[PDB]
Amino acid sequence: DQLRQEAEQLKNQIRDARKACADATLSQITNNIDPVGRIQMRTRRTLRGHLAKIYAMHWGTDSRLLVSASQDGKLIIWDSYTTNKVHAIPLRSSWVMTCAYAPSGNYVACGGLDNICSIYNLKTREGNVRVSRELAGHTGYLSCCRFLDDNQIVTSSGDTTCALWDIETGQQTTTFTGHTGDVMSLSLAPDTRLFVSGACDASAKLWDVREGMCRQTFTGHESDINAICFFPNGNAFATGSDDATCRLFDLRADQELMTYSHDNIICGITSVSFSKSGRLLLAGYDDFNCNVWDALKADRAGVLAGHDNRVSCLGVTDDGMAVATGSWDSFLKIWN
Amino acid sequence: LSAEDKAAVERSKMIDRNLREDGEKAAREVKLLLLGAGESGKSTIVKQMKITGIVETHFTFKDLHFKMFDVGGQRSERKKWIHCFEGVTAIIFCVALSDYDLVNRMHESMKLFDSICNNKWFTDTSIILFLNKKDLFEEKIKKSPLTICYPEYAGSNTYEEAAAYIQCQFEDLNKRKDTKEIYTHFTCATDTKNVQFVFDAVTDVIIKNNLKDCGLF
């Protein structure tokens, strides 16, 4: 076991090295900042066309159209300002767990419990919407998808691996393999140069797309982590776990920075998102409601209680004008 | 106001009525989840009926449309996707009755049954559990006793009471005997009258659901 102890020595060395740089305790640096106050938001729209519990959603960069998927076998594209249904796509396998919406707006993607990522062409001739590609090769179940270009997409699967594809060829360009449990979430950096993932190891890793190597590993949670999201600067991210706790990590200091927990919240977090300035942090819970946190002070600043079942998805527009939340309730609201 | 937005509203209404029709059409089917241990009887039950990630099967019997989902080809954390099947009409659990000797296997089947019966999502759904391979059990019961798997069995080594003992051991594993029912059937590889048993169990489930909806329950 001479080679099974050098790992322990290196772990101790890493712990000491990143404990030698901890001298500030962020909550002790933001002591003089003034609190945000009380954040009070009202629902502006209710979007009701689904006949089952919706599992994912995504905003368009237009900041007006969004897509949502449910176990009813449909994903349908909405117009937020008027609540008009622009499209309604019948999809082949009813067990879908994720959605994505291309930055250009020409395509959408879907996937789920059938091990396949499907890509649909929205802006086609001849009228209707068609299936462009159908990417196979995972062995688990699609957990998340994110478009890079019109011809590139990173996927996360419950077979412990992530992958990078090119859509016209249909083959995996690169595979990232360092986790030991299922991979449940994914987040692209603002410049799409490197991303971060969260698995059922209670650990998160930082990959770079151009070389397929893990750069850093972040630990500190106590259970499965279900959500992940970058800070708008691209130099930190937040996580959400079954631990009933979120927490903020730092890519340059290489360690935890703060934790967001309450003594009377004993339930897991399903989703996580930030604000346009990155000052307050949203988080969806299984308590049928989602909390708003003050990211620089850890205090609670509000509550969004308008659903009658678990909130399973949550997103904020690119212009920071509204937030949308879906739930197993089968509705999704827009809060401004 | 609403210059050519009226065409958009009309399109929304048309696709909305199409969604309503599709939902109504899909709300009159019974969905069945097919569980079981590793290669117990799950393959032959699909042939008893008319017939990557999961495999769906369709069939009809007396003006009723069925749907079996087999999720045995997906090895991963089961607690991360088992809540998708909440609301399934019933569960079909296949147990190999002749695997009380090989390895232990019956104890694994018992552990799986106990884990699935007392789950946080399936606290209400009923179970239709088959005991496959009773002819091999006929053959093997005389050669070797049933005390190999149950050390506390006190009875003759004949099929007629060993089968009842095994059935009772499976029956008495559920902690809610006033809320969920368990239907047992000693099936085999021939005389395909199993779909009638499934039909009767599903009809009882449907009657109970209707009673709950009407407010009488």
């Epitope: 007006r64 001849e126 | 210059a3 399109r11």
Partner: single-chain antibody, 232 residues
Framework: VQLVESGGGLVQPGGSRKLSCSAS????????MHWVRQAPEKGLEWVAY????????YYADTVKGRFTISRDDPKNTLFLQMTSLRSEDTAMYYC??????????????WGQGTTLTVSSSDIVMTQATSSVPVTPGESVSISCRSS???????????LYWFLQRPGQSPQLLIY???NLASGVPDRFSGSGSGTAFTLTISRLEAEDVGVYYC?????????FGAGTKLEL
């Protein structure tokens, strides 16, 4: 994508006729369809409109009562029943494909035309010029003008530009005054405030010679312009 019309020919005044438009190559039941006609040596003029699902129909005031529009979705055909044909109905009839949702481009594909011969508060769109001589490589501008502000309270101005080359059917260029239809080279551009619009062609070669029309989609009936012709 194809639209083919049939049912023309010489008719006597007071008679009746029926035209057909057989569509093949696109999802027919998702598109609303129009009938547009053009006199022997004159501009275009709208006739009738049948929505998707047949839930809405409109007619021009000069044909209301005598004409009837209907569609048969399973057969992929569009009909127009004409009765009491007077001598003013001599024209060529086009079949036009149009779909409306958020961000679509209606009026994009036109049929090919069938010629019919009969024996012997509206918004006014003004296209003052009627001909301009041009040279290849230069830049040309074309101006339209409306009697009412085409800007709506939701920020959309509803102005459309078409092109009809010699011997062919017209073709969409710009929709809602600034958007380029797919397949149109980026030489063309559109601009202008409410009640005054302009089309700009930069570095124009051959195959840009024809008549340019200007249409409003703010409210029915839809009205066209007189047309500006570019000669060589």
């Amino acid at each position: 994508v194809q639209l083919v019309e049939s049912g023309g020919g010489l008719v006597q005044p007071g008679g009746s006729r029926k035209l057909s438009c057989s569509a093949s190559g696109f999802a027919f039941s998702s598109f609303g369809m129009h009938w547009v006609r053009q006199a022997p040596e004159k501009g275009l003029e709208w006739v009738a409109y049948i929505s998707s699902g047949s839930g809405t129909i409109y007619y021009a005031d000069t044909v209301k009562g005598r004409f009837t529009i209907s569609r048969d979705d399973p057969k992929n055909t569009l009909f127009l029943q004409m009765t009491s044909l007077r001598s003013e109905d001599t024209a060529m009839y086009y079949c036009v494909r149009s779909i409306y949702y958020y961000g679509s481009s209606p009026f994009d594909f036109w049929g090919q035309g069938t010629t019919l011969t009969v024996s012997s508060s509206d918004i006014v769109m003004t296209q003052a010029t009627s001909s301009v001589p041009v040279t290849p490589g230069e830049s040309v501008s074309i101006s339209c003008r409306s009697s009412k502000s085409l800007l709506h309270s939701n920020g959309n101005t509803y102005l459309y530009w078409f092109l009809q080359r010699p011997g062919q059917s017209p073709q969409l260029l710009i929709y809602r005054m600034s958007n380029l239809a797919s397949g149109v080279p980026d030489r063309f551009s559109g601009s202008g405030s409410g009640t005054a619009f302009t089309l700009t062609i930069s570095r124009l070669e051959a195959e840009d010679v024809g008549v340019y029309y200007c249409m409003q989609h703010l409210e029915y009936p839809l009205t066209f312009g007189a047309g500006t012709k570019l000669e060589l």
